[PDB]
Amino acid sequence: MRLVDWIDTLFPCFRWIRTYRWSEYFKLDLMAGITVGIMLVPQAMSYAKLAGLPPIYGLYSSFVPVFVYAIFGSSRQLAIGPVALVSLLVSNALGGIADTNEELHIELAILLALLVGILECIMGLLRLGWLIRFISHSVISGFTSASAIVIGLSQIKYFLGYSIARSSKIVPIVESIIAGADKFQWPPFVMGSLILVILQVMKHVGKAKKELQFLRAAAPLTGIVLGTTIAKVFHPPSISLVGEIPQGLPTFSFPRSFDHAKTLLPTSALITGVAILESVGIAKALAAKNRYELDSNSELFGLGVANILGSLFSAYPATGSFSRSAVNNESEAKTGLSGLITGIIIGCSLLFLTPMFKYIPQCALAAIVISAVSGLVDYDEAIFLWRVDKRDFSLWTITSTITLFFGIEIGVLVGVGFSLAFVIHESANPHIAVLGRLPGTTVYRNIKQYPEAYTYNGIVIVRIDSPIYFANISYIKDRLREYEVAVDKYTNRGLEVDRINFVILEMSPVTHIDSSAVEALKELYQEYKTRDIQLAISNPNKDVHLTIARSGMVELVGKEWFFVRVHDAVQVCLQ
Amino acid sequence: MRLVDWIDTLFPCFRWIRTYRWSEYFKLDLMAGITVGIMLVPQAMSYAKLAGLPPIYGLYSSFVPVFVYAIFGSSRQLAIGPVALVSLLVSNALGGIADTNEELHIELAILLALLVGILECIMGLLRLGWLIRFISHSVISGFTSASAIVIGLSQIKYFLGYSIARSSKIVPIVESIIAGADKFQWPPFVMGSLILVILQVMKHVGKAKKELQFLRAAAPLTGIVLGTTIAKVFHPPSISLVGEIPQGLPTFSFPRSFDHAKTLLPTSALITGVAILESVGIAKALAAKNRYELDSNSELFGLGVANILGSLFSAYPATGSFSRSAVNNESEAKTGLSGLITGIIIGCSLLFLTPMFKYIPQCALAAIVISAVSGLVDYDEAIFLWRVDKRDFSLWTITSTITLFFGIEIGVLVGVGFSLAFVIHESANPHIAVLGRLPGTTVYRNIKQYPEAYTYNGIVIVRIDSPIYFANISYIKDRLREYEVAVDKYTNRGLEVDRINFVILEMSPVTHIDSSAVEALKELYQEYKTRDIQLAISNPNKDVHLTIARSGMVELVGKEWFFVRVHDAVQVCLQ
């Protein structure tokens, strides 16, 4: 194994190091990295506050994994760090375990990051990511919208100024807000409302214009730069600051709370599922847009390695960001260096900007989180689903409502269960076509023509428009037994009639068959002999023919009933 | 609603009452009922002993539900009562809950029967039985074989003569047997071995001959008639008798142990799943053999009603029997009256034969259970799978080994999970064909001919041989993006080359498309415009065309790129 291949195998970053056009790529990467870091620092602190951890642990979650991802990540525009959904899930798990320790929370979050990284590395090495991508996008969209509403209603407590009941359901949150309304304060609410209005106005102006689009990245910072100013001029009494923030880079430390690890598998999987469904999707979309190759397994392995190293350096789970990756995308980011620069910015903060961070009001961070999650309430997809596919709209509405009123875990379980139910329903109801004229197709909808001869009395030609395996064998057995039922009805009448003498199976679209398929075929052949019906096979696939010959069906039904076309099969059936 | 329709709707039994040919049907039904009752009484007591309940509760489980099933059951040959697998599952649940109460066991079993009946009625009314039939037959066969081995190794303790450790795993059972080998007794082992040998010889002789086939039904009784005789002549000291058995029909009593009901849902579902997979399968096979209609939903409703009434009359869950239903089948049973007569026989025992039952040795019942489950070790299917389908053989072996060494619940979970994994793998990897000549098909395997013109430079014709929905949309997106990757590779070379200008989709086999399909199609069209590739739709289905028009794809890509055939599409692409 030479170095040129071994290095590329272990370090995917070199995939863009060798093909690096310095002149334009360096300037574009530097600008994109600076922009993403500026957008990220306040967002990192706000998301850390959302998860229940002290704000500094957001910056850690952006420092070490980013440097790791830029070395082990396949995507060249994806931005790695805290996100709203993963922070919400981490907060959910920690609150379900620890109440007010403020010290077990940190260790639990770091252990959760380590478990998520290990699960991601396992699912990337084994290439088991396809086991999750069966979940419909409507379910994910509804769950994300409900999570966004829950996040906003949880963060409104900083605007109100009094602590509210901590829960993931809307009803207890609203009940607590109503109960505590007697402790309302005007200064924090006014500050939060003004900051949120300014942030949303800046974001809308940036998205409306094509050239003045950097405001989206400068919106989270500017609000703080605004809010702190009022905190340093008028000094409102009822506002709260983030307090002292430790200064310095995080140090190496193995997790010490493995005793709760078994409690964290249900969350560690869930977060990992998000990375399979959202982060990998963002990476693939960006790769398709930017004309480079990407695979869903190496990306998961890179995310897992980044999470593992972040856990080793006091970080909580970090995945791809819908907002930051986009902002990187229109910043003309070319390689993964834009990540490294971003990380460097974080490091600079951890060395120089922490003393100035203690004057940031908490309502400003709450407003930043609210602005970030306002774009996650994705009702446009709900309208689109209502217009196009009402089954998908029903799935979206059910998932959103259940996640809103019941827990996050209940909503996730309902969404996954409904997706599995619909997958099983589709697998268990294959399309079966009753063919008419020999070079023809389904008579019910496709072709109604009569080229002087369309169907033959006594012969039924059936095509199974799918591979036959254990999931759909029962439906096929029932459909083929309908002809026996028709024969029984004919023989049970008061007059002698029999219009089913031969049944021909078109197995040309049948890609493959398993043992259940040949067993059922033998059973139906025996039942047809009981009913005096002849079974024929028309267009066996090579693999299908080999399986049929191995199972002994050819000897049971006779070699003379196996053909290569429908024309000769029907011709010998008439004779 | 007239009586002729209402009565038939509520009471399916009348389906065979109206069409009843007295002369032959009465004699055949009477003989079949007597035969099944004779085979059932000892089997009922033996299975009740297997479940951990006192033997009499087997007879109850054959008395009231049978009379109910004959009124509410759709099958005319199915025999309802205790079975080996359901008894094993009931014993597993009870031992997991109650250790040696011998009184909470009865109430727990009756409550389990009520819960099973309610779940079956719910799944029959809602017609949700298709949610379970995706499980492969190999998984069920392996689980049943492992359960049979576990049942035999649990029942060998009566042969040994000393109590062994109660578990559902082979290793603790063998360890306990080795530990207790110092308490071995010769009389019970000799009695059990002789009874088992006689039973197996009788069963083999009955199955070998065509006319002397009643011995299979007389084997369980004869052994008792044998064993008791030695218990009444030589009186061995170390043998154990079933003891006093209460006399009389069971009385009405609602369950009183609802407090454990939530613990019993995981078992109540599992047993119900068995009824969906095994009992309904037996009913459908018998109906197909005997030339009458049967549906999988009314049968589940009848089983649920029978279970509910049995629970109301002190019975534990009862489903269809592989052995007794067969014995009914070659006994020329025609209607459901054969069930009623069988039940009557049970009633006679409960009125007259209970005093004579106290002399039955326990080793005789153990031998009966061992003989009953010896036929459930279904290695013939394992050999068949090894010969035909090695994936199914691997599933069978994994399920059997895990159920043998680990718990029943772990084996069930592994089997269901592997079946789901394979269903998802099949759904997520649809077949996509690269067509050659216009009235042609897949070029890789199907057709290699060259009718003077087969493929065109610059044009790729792709057919998706499946409906497009949320499960397989990712694979289709990747397959369609492979052409973009090829274009990128062509443009990244040292020479100017571009051999992908048009991509045509054959959507004739695409039965239907959902919202995810049209969203992905729009995304791929936009990416093709980025790569300067034209997207065309060749054979849209009527529903597919309607969905495409509703989603706005026709306006986005242009109406001029929608056709009805591949010939004209390629003709306009060349021009």
Residue numbers in the entry:
A (entry chain B), B (entry chain A): 70 to 644
The authors write:
Higher plants have evolved a family of SO42− transporters, SULTRs, that mediate absorption of SO42− from the soil and its distribution to the entire organism. AtSULTR4;1 forms a homodimer and has a structural fold typical of the SLC26 family of anion transporters. We visualize the structure of AtSULTR4;1 with bound SO42− and demonstrate that AtSULTR4;1 is an H+/SO42− symporter. We show that H+ transport is likely mediated by a glutamate residue (Glu347) highly conserved among the plant SULTR family and that the cytosolic STAS domain modulates the transport process.
We determined the structure of AtSULTR4;1 at pH 6.0 in the presence of SO42− by cryo-electron microscopy (cryo-EM) to an overall resolution of 2.8 Å. The final model consists of residues 70–644. The STAS domains are swapped between the neighboring subunits. The SO42− is located between the N-termini of TM3 and TM10, and is coordinated by side-chain and backbone atoms entirely from the core domain. Sidechain hydroxyls of Tyr116 and Ser392 are within hydrogen bond distance to SO42−; and so are backbone amides of Ala153, Phe391, and Ser392. A conserved Arg393 from TM10 is ~5 Å away and although it does not make direct contact with the SO42−, it likely provides the positive electrostatic potential for the binding pocket. The helix dipoles of TM3 and TM10 are oriented with their positive ends pointing to the bound SO42−, providing the positive electrostatic potential to the bound SO42−. A negatively charged residue, Glu347 on TM8, is ~7 Å away from the bound SO42−. In the current structure of AtSULTR4;1, both the bound SO42− and the putative proton sensing site Glu347 are solvent accessible only from the intracellular side, and thus the current structure is in an inward-facing conformation. However, in our structure, the N-terminus (residues 1–69) is not resolved and we do not observe densities at the corresponding position on the STAS domain. Although most of the dimer interface is contributed by the interactions between the two STAS domains, the domain-swapped arrangement in dimerization leads to the interaction of each STAS domain with the core and gate domains of the neighboring subunit.
